[PDB]
Amino acid sequence: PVRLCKEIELFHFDIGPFENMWPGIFVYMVHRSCGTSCFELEKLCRFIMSVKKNYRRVPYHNWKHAVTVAHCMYAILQNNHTLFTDLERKGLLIACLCHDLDHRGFSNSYLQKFDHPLAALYSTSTMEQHHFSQTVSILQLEGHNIFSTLSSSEYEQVLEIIRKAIIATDLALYFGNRKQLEEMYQTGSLNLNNQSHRDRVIGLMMTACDLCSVTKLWPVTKLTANDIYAEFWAEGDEMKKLGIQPIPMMDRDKKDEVPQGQLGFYNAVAIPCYTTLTQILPPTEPLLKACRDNLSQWEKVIRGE
Ligand SMILES: COc1cc(C)c2nc3[nH]nc(C)c3c(N3CCNCC3)c2c1
Ligand SMILES: [Mg+2]
Ligand SMILES: [Zn+2]
């Protein structure tokens, strides 16, 4: 539709009301960002449908989250087009769509605490290493290799861009990454032609995209909070059955602590993320402004309004 082609370019865009159109919205974004002759359309369409099939029916880490994260990346890339190569633009849009593949609704700490087989196989960034392994398995299916036309060198480079992008969605790594970028920016040392600086900037873009549900209009942001919390409470219920007391955010008997938990998450994680992203990429400012608006809505809930 002509109506949506205009709205897809904006940062605040909510995909929510167009479920049947999500596969077509992704194809359109790859076409406008990387060109209409980037991939073979038959191969791309099979890949998108196999990716959709490998997202589980969980309240938050599902097919909708994947398309939401991919659309945020598209809007960042469209507002900063010439800072990235054709291989990076295609690698990053794919990485976002595949970033939480086969998520079972449990965090890394639960899998490490209860010594699940995935934790023995992957000791750090447990789920993110699993998300990358699932992406490679889907690429290796008959008629799913979207990167068939690349040279063997370019195939290895794009898989390495994707691997680093998926691993960077581990929030535990974000804190140290953001502190380095903030230092590099203030001292005037940041340089995008330095490959180590480039990977860190890409990592922060991935965090900004993964947390973008805090940058939508208030009625949408508050309905997404219900879905994150239904996942956290289900994990906390399992910890209770196994004789371990869960942290407050994962405890369904401590809902009163949520508005204050959100205020702390916005001040310590979300606001610094979008602040540093705007300093490095000024056109991303609308994400920071939307985040400040939802912070001020959480301030209003705490004060009783
Ligand atoms: C782990 O501790 C927390 C604690 C709080 C209070 C959170 N509040 C949030 N609001 N919106 C989002 C999104 C979100 C969080 N997530 C960050 C990315 N990983 C999924 C969960 C949060 C994560
Ligand atoms: Mg993830
Ligand atoms: Zn995610």
**3-class secondary structure for the chain?**
CHHHHHHCCCCCCCCHHHHHHHHHHHHHHHHHHHCCCCCCHHHHHHHHHHHHHCCCCCCCCCHHHHHHHHHHHHHHHHHCHHHCCHHHHHHHHHHHHHCCCCCCCCCHHHHHHCCCHHHHHCCCCHHHHHHHHHHHHHHCCCCCCCCCCCCHHHHHHHHHHHHHHHHCCCHHHHHHHHHHHHHHHHCCCCCCCCHHHHHHHHHHHHHHHHCHHHHCCHHHHHHHHHHHHHHHHHHHHHHHHCCCCCCHHHCCCCHHHHHHHHHHHHHHHHHHHHHHHHHHCHHHHHHHHHHHHHHHHHHHHHCCC
Q: Are 55 and 66 in contact (CB under 8 A)?
A: yes
**Active site residue: 12, 31, 61, 130, which one?**
61
Hey, what amino acid is at 14? D
Q: How was this structure determined?
A: X-ray
Residue 99 annotated as part of some ligand binding site: yes
Q: What domains are there in the chain, each with its CATH number?
A: 1-305 (1.10.1300.10)
Ligand 1, atom 3, lies closest to the CA of 265
Q: Which atom of ligand 1 is nearest to the CA of 258?
A: 6
- Give the list of residues 6+ apart from residue 12 with CB closer than 8 angstroms, or none: 215, 216, 217, 286, 290
Residue 256 annotated as part of some ligand binding site: no
Q: Which atom of ligand 1 is nearest to the CA of 213?
A: 13
**Residue written as token pair 């994150």:** 228
From the CA of 131, the nearest ligand is 2
Q: Are 99 and 47 in contact (CB under 8 A)?
A: no
Ligand 1, atom 5, lies closest to the CA of 265
Q: Which residues line ligand 1 (CB under 6 A)?
A: 171, 211, 213-214, 225, 228, 249, 261-262, 265
d(CA 242, CA 264): 29
Tokens of 145: 């290799």
Angle at 22 between CA 293 and CA 283, to 5 degrees: 40
Contacts by residues 141-147 (CB-CB < 8 Å, ≥ 24 positions apart): 141/50, 143/42, 143/43, 143/46, 144/43, 144/46, 144/47, 144/50, 145/43, 146/39, 146/40, 146/43, 146/44, 146/47, 146/94
Q: Which atom of ligand 1 is nearest to the CA of 224?
A: 11
Ligand 1, atom 12, lies closest to the CA of 211
Q: Are 107 and 47 in contact (CB under 8 A)?
A: no
- Whether 131 is a known active-site residue: answer no
**Mutate which of 99, 233, 265 to test ligand 1's pocket (most atoms within 8 Å of Cβ)?**
265
Cα 116 to middle of ligand 2, angstroms: 17
**Specified resolution (Å):** 2.1
Cα 148 to middle of ligand 1, angstroms: 37
Tokens of 69: 């994260």
Between the alpha carbon of residue 128 and those of residues 36, 55, 88, 122, 150, the distances in Å are: 30, 14, 19, 9, 25
d(CA 182, CA 279): 9
Between the alpha carbon of residue 130 and those of residues 123, 125, 133, 135, 137, the distances in Å are: 11, 9, 5, 9, 11
d(CA 82, CA 78): 9
From the CA of 210, the nearest ligand is 3
From the CA of 172, the nearest ligand is 1
